[PDB]
Paper text:
PCC 6803 (Syn BVR)13 as a target for the structural analyses. BVR catalyses the reduction of the C10 double bond (γ-methene bridge) of BV using NAD(P)H to produce BR, a reaction in which the hydride (H−: a proton and two electrons) is donated by NAD(P)H. Syn BVR is composed of 328 residues and shares more than 20% sequence identity with rat and human BVR proteins. Syn BVR consists of two structural domains (N-terminal and C-terminal domains), with the active sites in an obvious cleft between them.
We determined the crystal structure of Syn BVR by the single isomorphous replacement method coupled with anomalous scattering method using an Au-derivative crystal. The structure of apo-Syn BVR was refined at 2.1 Å resolution to R and Rfree values of 0.200 and 0.239, respectively. The asymmetric unit contains two BVR molecules. Although the electron density for apo-Syn BVR was mostly of high quality and continuous, the densities for the N-terminal region (residues 1–8) and C-terminal region (residues 326–328) were poorly defined. The overall topology of Syn BVR is nearly the same as those of the rat and human homologues, with two minor differences: Syn BVR has an additional short α-helix (α2) in the N-terminal domain, and has three additional β-strands in the C-terminal domain. Comparisons between the apo-form and the NADP+-bound form revealed small but significant structural rearrangements upon NADP+ binding: the N-terminal domain shifted ∼1.0 Å in order to expand the active site, and the loop between β5 and a part of helix α6 (residues 129–135) moved ∼2.0 Å away from the nicotinamide ring of the bound NADP+. Because of the steric hindrance configuration of the corresponding site in the apo-form would not able to bind NADP+; accordingly, these movements reflect an ‘induced fit' type of structural change.
Residue numbers in the entry: 8 to 325
The structure:
């Protein structure tokens, strides 16, 4: 039903990219938003000339909203999605979908029972690099060894939700989502070993550093290392995504990529996350206005959630 009236829960990168396209597209209208922190809420309201709702609960219950975009504090995503679906809203999330596989399945069933969209993508984190990997995996043959490491030194560690044990949640959730979206080629994860180490702040509800490591064995033979570290103890940053195959190696350093085959080295064109967010937003608008089905289905985010549960279980986490 046009225009699609949108409320945005969140003010970060994913929320801003969605807001830009919702505004620009004539099939949609940005009505309200909610932010968790005072300064970023003010900036978002100014950029997009939309007034903020004081609570996200009020936003999702607004009768002048058709669609809720969720891209906020990690812990909140499942609860906000369930509340929005119960209020008869369509829901689009930036991954995570929920805290547990069971909640993700409960959300999937609820959206079906209400006949509402439940759509999840994972674009903000290395979305362009992921498509570049997809476009070039066919070139390197059987992938047997991959390493995805994100190390971000930060001193002092802030007292915000990203360093808060409960709000941030299991630290490997986002990284494991990235490594799990090649099931089409790697098969499913068959074995997991994972460790998680924290450096607590004086207030033990916050950590000042974390190092989480997951070592995965896939069914088609791939051994993958997935590393997530941030905080006060890290003196060298690292943003590496390397995949070794018997016909070549793909190396991504940040958003920079290079194909290596024999003695040749080729630059890899990495597209913008802005373009990927726009195509996804326009596909969502297509579905809501003409019923044309989305190419993405919830199964990819559900499996990433399963992998996260499995690695947390291997960690003794929660």
């Amino acid at each position: 039903a046009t225009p699609v009236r949108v409320g945005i829960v969140g003010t970060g990168y994913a929320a801003q990219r969605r807001a830009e396209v919702f505004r620009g597209d004539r099939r949609s209208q940005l009505v309200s938003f909610w932010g968790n922190s005072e300064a970023n809420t003010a900036k978002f309201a100014d950029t997009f000339g939309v007034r903020p709702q004081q609570s996200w609960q009020a936003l999702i219950n607004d009768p002048e909203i058709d669609l809720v975009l969720i891209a906020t504090i990690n812990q909140l995503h499942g609860a906000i999605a369930e509340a929005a679906l119960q209020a008869g809203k369509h829901v689009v999330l930036e991954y995570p979908l929920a805290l547990t596989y069971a909640m993700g399945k409960k959300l999937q069933q609820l959206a079906r029972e209400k006949g509402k969209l439940l759509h999840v993508e994972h674009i903000e984190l290395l979305g362009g690099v992921h498509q570049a990997i997809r476009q070039n995996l066919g070139k390197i043959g059987e992938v047997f060894y991959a390493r995805y490491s994100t190390i971000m030194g930060q001193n002092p560690a802030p007292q915000r939700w990203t360093y808060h044990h409960q709000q941030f949640g299991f630290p490997l959730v986002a990284a494991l989502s990235r490594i799990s979206r090649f099931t089409d080629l790697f098969g499913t994860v068959q074995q997991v070993d994972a460790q998680c180490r924290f450096w607590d702040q004086p207030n033990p509800e916050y950590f000042r550093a974390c190092l989480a490591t997951a070592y995965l064995q896939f069914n088609n033979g791939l051994k993958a290392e997935v590393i997530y570290g941030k905080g006060e103890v890290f003196h060298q940053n690292e943003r590496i995504f390397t995949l070794h195959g018997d016909r070549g190696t793909l190396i991504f350093v940040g958003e920079t990529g290079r194909l290596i085959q024999g003695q040749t080295e080729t630059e890899i064109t990495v597209g913008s996350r802005r373009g990927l967010f726009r195509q996804d937003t326009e596909a969502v608008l297509d579905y809501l206005t003409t019923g044309k089905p989305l190419y993405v289905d919830l199964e990819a985010s559900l499996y990433a959630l399963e992998v996260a549960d499995l690695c947390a279980q291997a960690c003794g986490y929660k």
